[PDB]
Amino acid sequence: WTPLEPKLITRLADTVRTKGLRSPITMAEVEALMSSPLLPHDVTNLMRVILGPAPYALWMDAWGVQLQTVIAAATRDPRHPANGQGRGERTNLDRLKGLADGMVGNPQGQAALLRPGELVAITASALQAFREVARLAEPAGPWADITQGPSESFVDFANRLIKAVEGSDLPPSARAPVIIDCFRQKSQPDIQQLIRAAPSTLTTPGEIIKYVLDRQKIAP
C-alpha cells in the first residue's frame, strides 16, 4: 500500500483548473502526471482531486464504459497490452479492477501481477472518462443515486450502498449514519418505520440491518 502525495497532484490539478477543466491543457497536464502507469484506485483518488466528488462519480460511469471498451477492444484485437500476454490470457474488467485473486488487498502485488501495459490502459481509459465528465456537468450523488427498492433486497441493496460509501469520499464517521440515513431517507415505510422504531443504542450499517432482519422474521 503506497499512498501517493495529493499535494503534488493538487498543484498539477490546480493548473488544470486555472487553465480550465474544459480546456485542452487539462489533457496535457493530466497526461503529464499520468504520463506514467498507475493503479486504478489511485486513478480515482487523482481524478477526485482534479474533479470534485460530484463529477467524480460521473467519471466512474465513463470509466466503466472506457474500461469495457478496452476489454472489448482487446477481445476484438488480440494484441492489446492490457492483455496478459497473448489472446490466451485476455484482459478482463475485473482484472483491470484489481479484484483478481492475489490482487485484492494488494496494490503493489497487484500491479506486479498485471503485466506492464494494462496500467497505462487504465490511465488512458481514465483520461477518456475525464473528458466525458468535462463535457457533462450533472450534480449526481454516489449514494444519492442509490435508492432502496422493493424489487431489490434490503440487505442486498444495503451492501451496494455500504460498498458505495466504503468507496466514497466520506469522513471517518459519515460511513455508517449515511448508509442508515439513506434507508430512512427514502426506502419504504415498512422498513423506514423499522429503522425509525430502531433502538438508539445502535446506528451502524450492520446492527440496523441485523435488527430489521431480526424484526422482519418470517410471519407467513
Curated annotation (Swiss-Prot):
- Cite the residue spans of the region called Involved in capsid protein dimerization: 41-49, 102-113
Annotated site residues (Involved in capsid protein dimerization upon acidification) in this chain: D169, D181
Q: Tell me where in or outside the cell this protein is found.
A: Virion
Q: Which domain of life is it from?
A: Viruses
Functionally, this protein is described as follows: Self-associates to form the irregular polyhedron core composed of hexamers and pentamers, that encapsulates the genomic RNA-nucleocapsid complex. Assembles as a tube in vitro. Binds to inositol hexakisphosphate (IP6), which allows the assembly of the polyhedral capsid.
**Description of how the protein assembles with itself and partners:** Homodimer. Homomultimer. Homohexamer.
Q: By what name is this protein known?
A: Capsid protein p27, alternate cleaved 1
The gene name reads: gag
